[model samples]
Every structure is written in C-alpha cells, then in structure tokens.
Target: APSFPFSRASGPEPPAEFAKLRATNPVSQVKLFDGSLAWLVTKHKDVCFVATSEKLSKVRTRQGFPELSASGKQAAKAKPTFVDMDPPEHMHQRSMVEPTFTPEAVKNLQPYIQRTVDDLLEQMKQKGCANGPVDLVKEFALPVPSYIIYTLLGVPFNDLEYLTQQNAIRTNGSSTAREASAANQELLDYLAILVEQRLVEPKDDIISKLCTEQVKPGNIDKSDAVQIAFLLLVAGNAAMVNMIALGVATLAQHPDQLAQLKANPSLAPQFVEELCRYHTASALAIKRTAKEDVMIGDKLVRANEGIIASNQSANRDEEVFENPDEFNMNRKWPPQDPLGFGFGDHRCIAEHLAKAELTTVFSTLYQKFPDLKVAVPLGKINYTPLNRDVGIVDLPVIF
Candidate 1:
C-alpha cells in the first residue's frame, strides 16, 4: 500500500499514507503531476494556512498551481475559470454571480431541487414494476445538479443530454483533454449567444443577471457572461455530481450507519457533513504561489514553487479529528469547513447549494427506499481521475 496513493493507480481502497505522513512530517515534500517537487500540505491547520496565506499567491501558475498551469499550446486553449485565477481578477469575476450564489440566493431553488429529488427517488423506489439495477450515477446523481446547472446557467433544458455529455467528457475523459477543451469552447460559444439573447430579452436567471451586471468594466473582459455561465455550469456540475454518486457509494458500504440515517431522516444533514469530510470528492484545490519566501515548517519554499493543498488528505489528518478516518454522523464537531469545500477567499461559494443537493438526494434516497445498496461487488467499481472528482464509472444500485 506504499504505492502512489490514488484510486486509479493504487486500486479502490482509501490511502493510509497521508495520516502516517502527518505524524512524520506535517509539511512534507511531494512531486507534482509534472516532474517538479513542491510542498504537500496535510495537516488541517497547514492546509488552511497555505490556502489563505496571502504570502502564497494563486497568480503564479506553475509555482502557484501546477495542474492548471499546463504549458505552451495547452494553456492557450484552456478557459480562464475563476477557480484558476488569483484575486482582483478572481474577485471581479466572482462578484458578478455573487448575488446569485449567496446562501440566501440558492434558498429559493430548494423547493425545486427537493421536487426533483423526490421524482428521482420515486423512480428509485419502484420495487417490482420498474425496478431493475438502477444506475444512481445516471438517474439520480447526474440529473440532480444538471437540472440546477441548466436552470441557473439559463441553458434551455431541451438539450440536457448534449450539455451533460459535454461536461462529463470534460471531467471524466483521460485522453479527451483536447476534446474536452473543444467542448468547453463550444459551451463558451453557446454562452455568448445566450448572453446576447438575455441582454436583449432579459430573464430572471443567473445568466440574465450576468449579462446585465457590471463585470470588468473595459478590459479585455475574460470574465464576462460567457465565462460566468461556463464557470457556474462546470463548477456546480463537477462538484455536486460526484458528491451524489460518492454519497450513495459510501453509505452503501456502511449499512449500519446507512440504516440508522434511513431509520431517522433528520440525521441526513449531519451525515452529509461527515461524508464530505470522510469521502470528500474534491481531490485538491486550485494552486497557490509563494508571494514571498515562506517557510512551510522547516522546508524553504522559494518565491515561485507551485503549491498544492490537498483538501481530501487534509480532512484525514489525525491532528484535526479524534478518529480522523471514521465516518460518523455524531462526530464531536457539528459543522466546520470540511477541507472538501476549501478555505480563505478561495472558499467555495457554491458549496452550500452543493451540500443542499447532496442532502436532498441522499435523504430522499434512504427515506424512500430503506434498502439501498450497490448491485455490484466492491472489487468491480471503476473510477475516473480527469479532474478533481473521484467518481464511479458505473454505480449499479438496488433497493
């Protein structure tokens, strides 16, 4: 198990090396996806510090955030996502949708999301008649956030499949990075058209608001309506979609906890929090730069070495939790920033709604079908790593 710790490379079991490293070196050295060595932050406190540390700027790409700072020809084709930017520009881009994504803002969509969850769960609950092996990844996990992405981005729902496929390829395809980039370009083209349409005949959705809002006044305007719409769709779709699939997959393995929550649905909210911490799907955060010469513990991280903050690994740090690896709804902490979302100005704004969608899906799922479990054996599970998500290729479930 002392191999490269990842689901794809090291098989499906969770990696235990991170906790071991926390005891050995809270701030350890790790090689990047490229050949270079950068600081690997594991402890919760260090993860937070690296995330928020003004000294560690997100602007310096290769040294600041390696995965995103793909070189030469590839960088030109990539879209400038807000998650990739360092402040000023990042804030300027974020502000346009800030009004729409606020916790109170997404509250209005609660009823709509709940309704959608109910319909999907109802589909899942069809015991004998419509019951076959249900693919939660396709039926529940996919649509729950998708519908929200469509509604929020103001994309016509008539083309949900095309849109869903495009986003999926962007997230799950390994060799399809170039293809995904093209799909993203197509999406951006579609958004430009929609932005124009909305500007002329404005509606009451997130996209329309972006078209009318004040973004970077007179610059080249990389973060315009097209960019905003693209960002929201990808952001919400990537995070929420994996959360739903992983939520069930995780709970299915832990039947006692699953049954306990199913027996009393009120516990679902608490369960979601623990699940995010334990089975957190966001593998890592956007990169950060060393604003100045900074000392990560005793290691001298020079001014420009790319920094990676592993939220997934940070959540499992023994110093942060009593039994950091356990999945418990009744953990001592009620609610805290699970490294899953992120820390500092980089904290995820869409996190609340993501949590809400996950809660709605898992709650309705267990409540409606008291006997939900994976149809396939554990060894057969397949996962993708094209993005930060750790999601299954096929989640065949039965209730």
Candidate 2:
C-alpha cells in the first residue's frame, strides 16, 4: 500500500501518486506514519462524501482517528474545539463564532485589511529591496494575518512574538511530544488569562463576546471558551500565512495570469479562489474516523476505521477541473465548490476573511511594486513538508 502523506518532488503540486490512485483505486488503504492504516479517499466526489457523511466522525479523540504526528496526538486530548466536535455540538459552538466571519463582517474588515497590507508593503519598501532581496514570508505574509487575528481577539500586539514562538513549537513535526504539549499548555494558559480578564472587564472583541455571552450564560465552560479562542487563533493564522505566501509564489511563477491580475484588480476574488484550489495548502488536515460501516466509493470503511480525504487530490481531480495540472485563473469551476477550504459542515470558517486578505494582497502588491519577482528559482525554494500545511520557508523577492 502507498504510504499516507505522500511526498512531493517539488513545490505545491500534488504528488504523482494521487492521479494513479484516483484512476486505479480511488478508496485504498494506506499506511500512516505510525504504521496504522487509513482509507485514502482520492476522487472529488468520494472526498466530498467523506467530509459530509454522518458516518464519519471528526472527534480527534475517537478510536482510530488518523493523527499524523506526535503533536497531533497530544492535541487530541485537549478540550475539543468546534473543529473536532460532531453534529449538534459542532453546529452549536460554530454558530457562536459564525457571526464574526460572515460576508458582511469580512466586508467591514476589508478597509482594515487593506491598510494592513499597505503598511506592510511600505515597510518592505524601506527594507531597500533594490540593494538586496527581502524575505516576503517574514516581512509580509506572517504579519498580515497575525495583526488581524490579534485585533479580532483583542489580544495585545506586544505578545505576538511569544505567541508565534509557542505556536511554532506546538505545530512543528520535529518537536518531541513533551515539547509540543508544553507549548500547547503555555498558549492555552495565556488565552485562559485573557478570557478571564474579559469576564471581569469585557472589551469589544471575540474573547469578550464569548465570555459575556457564552461563559456568563453557562452555555460553555471557561476552558471551552479558551480552547475556542486558541482554535480561532491557530486555525485563522497558520492557513492564511501559508496561503498568502504560496499564492504569491504561484502567481509569480505564472506571469500571464499575474499580468491579468495586475491589469484588472476586480479579478482578485477569483484569483484567490483559484489559488486555494490550485495549492490546497491545508490538504493534510481533512481527517475523519468512520463511526459505522459506510460504503465510500467501491470500498467498505468499517467501524473504527480511519479516513483521510485527500483535499489536494480532490482539488486536482481531472473530472472536476479541466487541465488539472495547469494553474489557470480563468478556468471554469464546477457547480460545487472545490475541496480547498474543505466542504460540508466543517468548511473553513475564515473563508471570507482569508479571501479578503488574499484579494487585498494580490491586488495591491503588484500595483505597488510592478517589478517584484522571486529572487531564487521556483524549484530551489524550500517548501514545508507535505505532512504540514504546504508553504515556503522563506520567500526572498526583489523589485
């Protein structure tokens, strides 16, 4: 059986094995990192079914849940966030935070998002880009989302570096289980304090709202509120960071598409969708455990079996996307949305916020620096492992 978390030879492209599996065995058993077996759902339709099926459970602590790393297993034991909850519980907790991410809410945030982008670009310009290349991931991609999330949570900006370090340790695959657990605890403790402060002195932020509305009303425990905040911070920041960096890299590689984007800024939203579909940065994250016997495609996924719906493969399925290998902004999308942010109940909550950030960045970056280009060859750029969110380590660019 093919090993789960297939390796890519280079860049953000899906592994070659995906196409082969999609053709011959769409739902096949694969060996995970721990020698456990999981049904790797490859086809678009099957992956979508796996995502939305009631028979599959998102509860990470459940028996036979597919965890890719030691940190993931450590995280599974923590207070379950809405992301890890199933059914009625999932919808209940999700609804509390849903209002903040609605289209109108995100629309309200666009001006702030635009200003944040402009400020970061201005700082980049001061870095003397003409003399030496600047790392875009460090200067631009990381801070854009960090600042936005901080504002949303009403967390102090001074603590960003500490939070960033803790999050890196918590998510890094190389970290020992003990180290990961320690980092996770530190973050939770920090958020717990913030949540408590909001209880006594409410602010106009997510944590405050949760404390006043949920915790005060006995709707959720204080710990649950903390975990929810933690979830929002980690989920909202990491994926956007990766997407912004990879999106820019992808557009840089495809100059014709980049030219079109530069010519017509209105295409920013479409460009963002195409980028999400093209890269599928969070592909490895869509894991579920079968709760009962269910037929996925032609195979039976028995009770207590692990399932990995390969969003990367699903996004690239030729049946859904014409010329799947090519990154075309003008490519026609199917009636159903692609599996980039995932599908069904657990689709990304920050979709609108993410799109707004990317749209502003893509639309504004080139207009500010028309000559911007990646300093190194695309193939030579270091990429985060496929086991984690697919992203560049450093994106050094010059104008």
Candidate 3:
C-alpha cells in the first residue's frame, strides 16, 4: 500500500489501494516514486479542505513540495508556470487569460463546437476502417480537442502533428525526466514564435489577446505568454482527449445508462458531471506543499511537506455517493462535491468549455449512432501509461 500514485497498470478504474486507504486512514502518508513521503488525503471533505487552504501552496519550486516522480522534480526545477505559482503571481497570470475561458467566451463558440463535433463524427462515419474496427480515440477524440485548442491559441492546425508529438513526450510516464524537459523546451520555443506573431499583428485569439492586454501593458512578458499558451495547448488537449474517449466508452459499456441518456437528451449536463465524478481521468487532481502546520482530518500535516488531494478517491467516497462505484446517472443532479476539476484557486479554468464539448459531443454522438458500441472486448483495449492519467490508448468502436 506504499505505492503513492496508486493507479492500475491496465484499467480505467481507480487503484484498489485508495479504497482501503479511504476506509481506514483518510489522511495518511505513502511512499512516492522518488522514495519521498507525502500525505495522501482521500476523503471528499478532507480533499476539499486541503485543496482550498491557502496554507498549502501549489508552488512546485517550494522546498518540500512533492516531487513525486523524476519528471515532477524536473518540473519543480524549471521556470514556474501559473499553476506552479501561488497567490498574487498565480492570480495575476491566471487573470490575464481568464477572459478567454469564461462562460461567455465558451458560449460564443457554441456554433463552432457544434460544427466541429459534427465534422469529426462525419469523419468517423466515413473512415470505414478495413480492419473491421474504428478507433474513436484517433479518428475523433484526439482531433476534436487538438483542433479546438490550436484554433483558440492562434496556432494553425498544420502544426498539430508537431504539438501532439511533443505533448506525448511530456505526458508519457515512461519517458525520462530529461526527455520531458527537452520536449517542454521545444514546445516553449514554438510558442515563443507564435507569441511573436501575435505581438506583431494582434489577431482575435487567446495569444493575441494575451499580447495586447497583458504583454503590451507590461502586466506580463513574452515568456509568461509562452507558458500560458503551453498550459492551455498541452494540458487542455490531453484532458479533453481522455474525457471524450472515456465518456463514450463508459456509456457504451453501460447500455442501460446509454439508453437513459439518449432518451432524455436534456440530461446531458447532469450526465457529464456524473461522468467526470464517477471516473476521474486524473488520479491525482492537484498536490500542494504545506506552508504551515495544517489539520486535514484527525492527522496534522506538518509545514514544508507534500500533500496530495486525491480527486479519484474523493469522488468515489461512499460517504459522498450512495453507490460510489456504480455508474448511475440518477443519483444526484448538480453534484456539489465532486472534484472533476480541483477546487479553490487552482480549479480548472476551462471547466465551462470542457462541459460544452462533452454535452455537444455526447448528445450528437448518441443521436447519430443509436447502436454505437465497443468493437473489441474490454480486456483487449490498451489504457494509457500507468500513473499518468487513466485513459484508453484507442477506443475501437462499431456503429
């Protein structure tokens, strides 16, 4: 039970270690990949407390911040991004791009999202894989978000291949820390060029807005813009890719629920929330460094120690949900406690946009192919690398 991350190697389910830990010691220490010790807070309420407390800083560079892996240590040593900074610095950087992810901004893109989802579905329909199976991951899920993020960042679609290749290296757990660092630097280099373009001829895009509003105003620098763009491009694409693929796979696996969803298409928002809560893609939502002694549960977390707020376990806490493990859509509407995105200052900025994509994609997909399902046995589907994110490498589906 010392495995800190506690993820299954070949499944999309939360690690078995979490359930045992939650049932007994909700706030406890486990051995990290780097042979360091960090407190893992698993219960729903405790996670909220730990995540929201200002005493726990997200600054990875802070001494004693959990460098859970070699890549994590490298990231800590690297220049701090918005997510890596705390308080005023984090708030200022985040505020610069906050307008782009607002509900209003996402609303403006509704028509575009609808068209994009439809276009991807058409590609899937026409793919006609001669191998007798089609992978939604490649044909639809991956491309949809990649295209959307690239468009938003003012990065052309032509560069997606390069962006995706670099992203794989950065996120793949099997890659060495040095490799990930190199990939990150390469991406930053690319973004620097893109930022220069925006600076010269301000366009109507996120990066352009960043240049006009923040960079030109002396609120931030070009390097700051690069890191922001990097976060949005790499992080945004990865999460949406996993969410879309898994959302479809989860519904396909539970036909009864799928039928319920299709029959009541208006229930999409609720369904998507539950989908996020029920099967968290990111096993570890956000980890923090305790700046001062804090009481998470009965346990006292000391100053200058690492803390992991487990969204995976918190979402499934039996105390929070009646049947935490079951995939039921009717349990509760507008789930107030699920940490699909981390809470407090570090909450996902793109939550609204992600919801829009999920609802549109699921609604249209089920409406178009009432008979969509997994083409291969569940046992054969290869999930993503362990301890990275719980996601399928490819979802072979038949319509």
Candidate 4:
C-alpha cells in the first residue's frame, strides 16, 4: 500500500489509520506515492534508530534512495546541500553555518522579530481585522518570517514576494515538478547574484559573512554556499508558516485548552513544544539510503534498500506518550518527545530560530486577540496535501 494515505481531509497530519500501523507493525515495507518500495519506520524506538543510524544515510543525491514522490526523485539528483550530505562534509558545512543559529544569536534577533510581529499585526488591524475577518495566513503568518529572513540574508524586501512564490513552487506539488525545479533554479540564480553583490560590498548580513569567511577561504565553494542559502530560503520561512497557521487552527478547535493557555500566558513555550508533538507538522522526515542490510525493529532486508522515518507516527507513539491523540496541555514534556524535525545530524539547525519565531508569533497573536476565532468552520478552510509540510492557502480568522 502507498505509505501515505491518498484518502485524507487534506493537510499533513498522519492519517487516522496510521495509528494502527504504529500500534501493530511499526516497521513494515510499504509502497510510496511514486510506486516505489521502502520500509516505513513508525515506532518511536525505530524512528530514533533510523534517525541516528549511520547505516542509513541522508546522502540521497544518489539513486536507489526512497522517494515519497517521483518529483522528489527528480529533485534529489540535483546538487546537494549540507542537509543532503553525509558526515565529514555535512559536519564541516553545517559547522561553518551553525554559529548563525546559536541560542545567543537567535536571542539577539528577538527585538527585530518582535518589531516585525508588531508591525504585521498592526497592518492586519489597520485592514480592519479587529471587526472583520482577515486571512491570517496571508496578512500575518507569511510576512513575519519572510521579512525576518530577508533582513538576515540582506535580500531586499522588494524581492520577498518573488522569493515566497518560488518557495511555494518548490515546496508545494505542482502540475509538473519540472516547473518547480525551474523555479528553484531561478531562485538560485537570484541568490547567486546577491552573493556576488555581498562579496563585493561586504555587508553585515549572513550571505556577506559567508562569502567573506567560508566561500573566500574555499572551505565551502561558491555554488555550495548558494545552495546553503537556497536551503535556508526553502526551509526557514516554510516551518513558521505551517506552525503559525496550523497552530492557530489547532487551538481554535480546542477552546478549553486555549482558555488554559490564555490564563497562563507564560505557557506559550510549552504550548509551542506540545504543538510540535501533537501536529508533527512535517509528517515524513529523513529518508535514508541504507548502505547494507540492517534490522530496524522487526524488519530486515538486503543491502541498498531505503527507509523513511515517520515523525508524525512516532510522535504519537503510545509507548512514549500517554493519550497521545489528546492535545493535553499539561502532559509531561520529554527530552526526545517530539520529532517534528528529525533527530541527530540532520535535525533542524534552525530550531532555535523557529522556536523564537513561533513563540513570538503565537504569543503576540493570542494576546492581541484573546477572543480570536476561526472565521469559517474548520472544514471550510482549504488544506493543501502533504508536501514536506501540509500547508493552508488561506486561514480566515476574526477577533
């Protein structure tokens, strides 16, 4: 069977049927959307094993790796970033970029993030959201990260719309995946130009710093630098978009829980963590090409097979979580409770930035509009299918 359900109410939360898979055969061979065969690891134990196992790899630029969709296979053949690389090279590249996302570095960006949030919220208010319904996804959610990212990269805000459009093409499944690939190339072309500019002017931004420090020293090639920037472009804004939109929708659906959160505004951080666990926003995480035969739970196979670690299913494992399906605000938070991002080397390096962004956005959002509500019924909203992260094109809300 196709590992991912074709039958769903849209959006990327794992299928209700996935619960059965987690409970029974946590590791099993399943067909993919591309009609390819791969092992799906659903149990928390196995998911962690695959995530940390060097036997399974993120070096997926080569063929014979599992691809959830055919278009994914096509994209995988392209040049790789650190995210797509194995150790040594992955470590070196990530090490060069890691300083930018350190806790202190992200903390330093908070004042700017807070300002952006205030302005975006004010813009929504000016458009009469306080009295009338407004599309939160468009007005607030999209701009917050886009603006912040542009500042970080020194990309002009004039190009934010173009960047966001290209990202949409890359992340959302299009009519033909080739067009998205073309769009991605177009974005790289744009970033390449910006990199050249920053190399010359030497601005106080990430691209400039990268060009001066790593790119100039030959630690990371210019092309690899551009790809890293491209990875950030595709990943950085995308996570916040889903969390803000879906996180809001999740709370809106559970008022009593929302009320508890409202009562203790200090709970926003915990709420965000719980939100990550509950939603598993990116349902499918790391896909690895196994170097040789290895046991992952009960499954055993030959060399050169593929494995997909199911983050969504693992997050809901009853073995790790009590009443995993229930959105319990008071549930005990575990160190490794959530696999929203994969674990180990491929784990999101931008996690601190994401946490800061999500906390600021959600806290400000609910604080400004305690009586905030979904303008339309939950079922009325349009949900895009699972494409990396399940996203909403429109999230209408009223306060």
Scored by TM-score, the top model is 2
lDDT of 1 by residue, 1-399 (tens): 121223332323345556666788767666654556567777777788788877877653344355433443255345666676777788877776787667887788789889978876676565332557867777778877887778777877687767777777776656366987788778778778887787778788887776666432443342456776776787658667767777777776677888788888888788888888876666655457687888877678887776766787777776667687687878887344677888888788788888788778767787777766788886676665423346666688876
Worst 10 residues of 4 by lDDT: 4-13
> Clash pairs of candidate 4?
none
Alpha carbon RMSD to native, model 3: 2.2
State each model's CA lDDT, in order.
0.70, 0.85, 0.82, 0.77
- Give me the runs in candidate 1 sitting further than 4 Å from their true place: 1-14, 60-65, 68-73, 76-81, 123-131, 174-182, 215-223, 334-336, 385-389
lDDT for each residue of candidate 2 in 282-383, tens digit (9 for 90 to 100): 887678998899998789999999999998999889898889888888878888678788888999998888888999998999999888899999878778
lDDT (10s digit) by residue, model 3, range 195-292? 99989998888999999998999988898898888888876677788888888878877878888989988878878888888768765658888999
Compared with the true structure, model 3 gives a TM-score of: 0.93
Candidate 4 lDDT over 53-107, as tens digits, reads: 8777777764558877766777787878788888877887888778778899999
Model 3 residue runs over 4 Å out of place are 157-186, 333-335
**lDDT of prediction 2:** 0.85
Worst 10 residues of 1 by lDDT: 1-10
Model 2 spans with C-alpha error above 4 angstroms: 161-183
Look at candidate 1 and tell me the lDDT of residue 253.
68
lDDT of 3 at 119: 85
